[PDB]
Amino acid sequence: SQIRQNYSTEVEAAVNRLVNLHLRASYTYLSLGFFFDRDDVALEGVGHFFRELAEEKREGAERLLEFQNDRGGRALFQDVQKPSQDEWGKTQEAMEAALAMEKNLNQALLDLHALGSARADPHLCDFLESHYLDKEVKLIKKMGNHLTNLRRVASLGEYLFERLTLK
Amino acid sequence: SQIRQNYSTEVEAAVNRLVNLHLRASYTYLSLGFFFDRDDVALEGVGHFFRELAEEKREGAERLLEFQNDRGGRALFQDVQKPSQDEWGKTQEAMEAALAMEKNLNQALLDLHALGSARADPHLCDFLESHYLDKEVKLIKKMGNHLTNLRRVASLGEYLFERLTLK
Amino acid sequence: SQIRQNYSTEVEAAVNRLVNLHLRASYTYLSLGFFFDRDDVALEGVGHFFRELAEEKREGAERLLEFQNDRGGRALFQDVQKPSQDEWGKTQEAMEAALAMEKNLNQALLDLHALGSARADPHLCDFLESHYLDKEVKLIKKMGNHLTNLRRVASLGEYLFERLTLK
C-alpha cells in the first residue's frame, strides 16, 4: 500500500477478526431483539434495548473497517456465525448472556490494544481508547446495573422493570 | 402460537431463509462498499452506492423478521455466509455482480410469493408486493441503466461515471 | 464485581487515594478563597480565583469516584485533612503554595498513569490523559504566568494585579 506506515500485519489481521466479533455480537443482539418481540414474550423495552445494541455493534464493526482502509490494510470478511441460542429465556438470563458477550468483546479490544502497544502503534491505541474502550466500560456498567435491578424485582417484577427502567 | 392463523410452516421456513438471503446480500454490499474505499481503488461514489444498499438489504431482512413475529412464526437465524469475492474488480464488474445478486434475491422473493399463492396466504402475498417486489424491479432497472452507462464510457470513463452519475 | 475486568486492586486503591488528594486540594482552595475575602485582606479577584479551583478539584474527585464505580472498584473515603496553613500571606505566597500543591497533585496523577501502564490498563490511562493531565499542565502554566506577573508588579502592584488580571 502506498499509504501504509507503522501498520503491522499482525494488527491488520487482528482488526479483521475484531470486525467479525463485532458483527457476531450485532447478530446476537438482532436475535435477542426479535425474541423479545415474540407475542409469547412481548417485552417491548427489552426488545428495543437489544435492537439498539445490534446497531451499536454493527457501527463498531464499520468503524474498524474504515480504520483498516485508513491504515492501508485489507478488509477480509469471514462468515458471521449464528448466535449461541435460538431462544433467550427471561430478561435476566438474556441480560446475563449480553454481559458475558460484552466482556468477551471488551477482552478482545483490550487484547488488540496490548498488541498495538507491543508493536508501537500509537494510532491504533488512540483509536481503540477513543472509540471502543470507554464505550465498553460504560455499557458493561449499565448491564450490571440492570442485572442488579432485575434481581431486585425477582413475573410481575420483570414486567415492571421493562415498563419503568427500559421505557 | 395464540395468534397464528393461515400461516403455513412452509412459509414460516421460507421466510427464515429469505431473511438469511437478505443478510447475505447486505454483507456482500458491505464488502463492496469498503473495497471501493480502499486507497488503491478510491471511487467514493461507488463505495457509497453499495453501502446504501447494504443498509437497504438489512432493512429488508429486519422487515421479514417483524413479519415472522407478526404472523406467529419463529425467527431462526443461520450463519451469514461471507461474500463470494474478497476483491470486486472495476466498477462494471462489481455492478454486474450486484445485478446478479439482486436477480437472485428477486427470484427468491418471487418463489416465496408463489408459495404464498399456493398456500392461499394473501397477507404474505400483499406483504411481498407492497415492500419487496417493486423495490427489486426498480433497483434492477437502475443497475441495468448504470451498466449501460459504464459500458458507454469504457480508465477515465470509470472516473467520470463515478463523478457524474454516482455523485 | 460482575462488571470488573482488567482492573487491578493496586489501581483501585490508588484511585481512592487520588480522590482523597483531590478533596484535600479542594479544601485548601476553600481556605485560600475565604482568606482573601477577609476584610483585612480583601482581594476579591484572588478569592474568586481560588474558590473556582476548590470547585474544579472537587469535580476531579467526583469524576474519579464515578470511574471507580464504572470499573467495579469500591469507593473508600478517608478523612480530608485540614489545609497546611490557616493564613496564606500575600497573593504571591498564596499562589506559590497553590503551584506547589498542583505540582504535587500532578505527580500523583502521573504516578497513577505509570501504574496503569505497568498493569496494562489502557482505559485508566485514557481516562487520566483525557480529563486530568492536560488540565494540570494548563493550570500549572497559568499559575506560573501569574507568579511572573506578581513578581513583575512587586503593595500597590498587588492591588493592580488583582484588579487587572484577576478581574
Added chain:
Amino acid sequence: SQIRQNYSTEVEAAVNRLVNLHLRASYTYLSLGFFFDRDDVALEGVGHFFRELAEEKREGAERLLEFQNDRGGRALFQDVQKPSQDEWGKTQEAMEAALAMEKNLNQALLDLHALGSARADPHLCDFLESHYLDKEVKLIKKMGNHLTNLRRVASLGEYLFERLTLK
C-alpha cells in the same frame, strides 16, 4: 477586626464548628450517593437524592464561612472526618442514617441559635432562622415522609420507590 461588632468569641468558635459539621454531612452524602451508584446497588434515584444533599450541606458550610468573614471572625478549618460507614445498606437504612444526621445537624443549629440569644446577637439569630432552621425542618419532614413510604412498600417495593418517588 475593624468591622467586628457585637460578635462574641464564643459564637465565632461555634460558627467554625458548625462549618465543620456541615462539611462532615456533605461528605457523608457524597459517600451515600456513590454507594447507591455501585453496579451491585444501582438505585439511581437514591444516589441522586443524596448527591443533591451533599451539595446543599456544602453550600450551608460556605454560607457560614461568608458569615464568619462578614462579622469579622476568622475561619479556622479542621479535618473533615470520614463518614460513619463505608457501606450504607438498603434504601431505608441509608435514609434512617440521613435522618439521624440531619436531626444532629439541626440540634447543632438550634444550639448555636440559643448561644446567639444568650449573647444577644440578633444578626446571628436572623441568619440562622432565614437560611438554616426552616430548611432543616422541611428536609427532616421530607425524610420522614420517605421513610414512611419505604416502610409501606417493604425487594420489589424498594425498586418501585426509587422509580416512582425518587424519579
Added chain:
Amino acid sequence: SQIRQNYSTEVEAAVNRLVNLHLRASYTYLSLGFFFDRDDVALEGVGHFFRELAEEKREGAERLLEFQNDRGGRALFQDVQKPSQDEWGKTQEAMEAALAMEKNLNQALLDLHALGSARADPHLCDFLESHYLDKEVKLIKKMGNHLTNLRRVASLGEYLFERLTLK
C-alpha cells in the same frame, strides 16, 4: 522553569526539531501552491489544495510551540530550509512529493511519540495522538486516494481531476 515537570530535555529538543519540520512542510506547500497558480500551469484546485496544507502545517508548528511553553521548555528556532524543488511537475508528481513529505513528517511524529513513551511522558503522548497522528493518517489516506484517481485519469484527465475532484 517553575512549571516544568516530567518534561525531558530530550523531548524538549525533539519538539523544537518537529516545529522546524512542520515549518519546512508548510513552506514546501506554499511553493507547491504558487507553482500551480502560474499562468503556464493554471490548475486552481491543485493550487488551493496545497495552499490549504501550507496553513495546516503552519498551525501544527504553532501548536507545538504552545506545547513547548506549556511544559516549560524553550522554543528555539532554526532556519526554514527552502523546498526541495523550484518546479513541481504535473499534478501526479506534485502529489507524490506531498505524500512522501507527509510520510516523513508522520514518521517524525511517531518517533517523538516513541521517545515520549520511553521517557514516560503521557501528556506528550496524548498531545500527539489527539492533534497529530490521526490527522496524518487521514491526510495520507486522502493523498493516496487522489493519486489513484490521478493514475486512473492519465492531459485532459489531469484537467478533469482538478475540475471534478479538487473543486
Added chain:
Amino acid sequence: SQIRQNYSTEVEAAVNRLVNLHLRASYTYLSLGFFFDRDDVALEGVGHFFRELAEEKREGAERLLEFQNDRGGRALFQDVQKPSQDEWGKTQEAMEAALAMEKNLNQALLDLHALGSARADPHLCDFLESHYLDKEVKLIKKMGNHLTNLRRVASLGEYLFERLTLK
C-alpha cells in the same frame, strides 16, 4: 511567459527577495510572540501584538507571490533565516527590535519602488503604494507611539502597559 509585459527581470528578482524579507520578518514575529508567552515572561498582550504581526508579514509575502505570478515572473524561494535573537528582553527592547525590522523592510519596499520607477513599471509602483507603503508608515508610527509610552511608564509600568494599551 505568454502574459509577461513591461516586467523587468530586475524587478522579478527583487520581488523574490522581498518575499523572503517578509517571511523573515514573519518568522521573527513568531519568535517574539512565543517568547512573550513563556511562563517566565508572561505578557499576553505583547505576545498577541507580535503574533498578529507574524500573520501580517506572511500575508505581505503571499501577496507579493501572487503579484509575481500575475506579472509572469517566477517565484523562487530561499531559506527563511532564523531570527536574530533567541530571547527578546523586556517589552521595550523587543519593540525596539521590531521597529528596526520594520524600518528595514520599509526601506526594501522603497528601494523596490525606486527600481519600478527607474524601469517605468507603474503597475508595480501602484501595487506597492496601495498595499505596502502606507501600511508600513502606519505600523512604524504605532510602534513609535508604543515606545514613547513604554519609556513613559519605565517593572510595574511594563505590566500596566501590557494591560492598558495592548489589551
